[PDB]
C-alpha cells in the first residue's frame, strides 16, 4: 500500500540475545556517526526473533522499550538493544 506499515512486536529475549543484526541507513551532510534509521540486516536461525517469526530482514526497528532508534548512532542503537532483558517491546516498520 502507499502508507507505511508500522506494527508492535513483543517477544522474550533469548540467552544468546535478541538474535538479529542491525545496520544504519541515512546520514546528515556533516557525515558524523548519527544514522537516520536502524534496520535489520540478518536474523539468527533459532534465535528469539526467528522463533517469533514476525520481524524480517530490511524491517526498520523504530523504537525499543520506549527508546527511539531514529537519529542515533549504530553503537547507541546496538547498546540499547543489548541492554534489553526479559520481555522486549518494539515498534517495527515495513
Amino acid at each position: 500500500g502507499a502508507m507505511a506499515h508500522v506494527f508492535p512486536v513483543e517477544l522474550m529475549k533469548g540467552p544468546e540475545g535478541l538474535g538479529l543484526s542491525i545496520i544504519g541507513m541515512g546520514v546528515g551532510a556533516d557525515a558524523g556517526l548519527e544514522k537516520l534509521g536502524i534496520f535489520v540486516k540478518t536474523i539468527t536461525d533459532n534465535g528469539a526473533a526467528a522463533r517469533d517469526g514476525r520481524i524480517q530482514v530490511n524491517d526498520q526497528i523504530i523504537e525499543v522499550d520506549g527508546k527511539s532508534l531514529v537519529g542515533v548512532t549504530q553503537a547507541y542503537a546496538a547498546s540499547v538493544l543489548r541492554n534489553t532483558s526479559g520481555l522486549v517491546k518494539f515498534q517495527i516498520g515495513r
Binding site: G17, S21, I22, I23, A75, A77, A78
Partner: peptide, 10 residues
Amino acid sequence: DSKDVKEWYV
C-alpha cells in the same frame, strides 16, 4: 563509506 560498515549483532 556507509556501504561497507559491519552489522552489529544483538
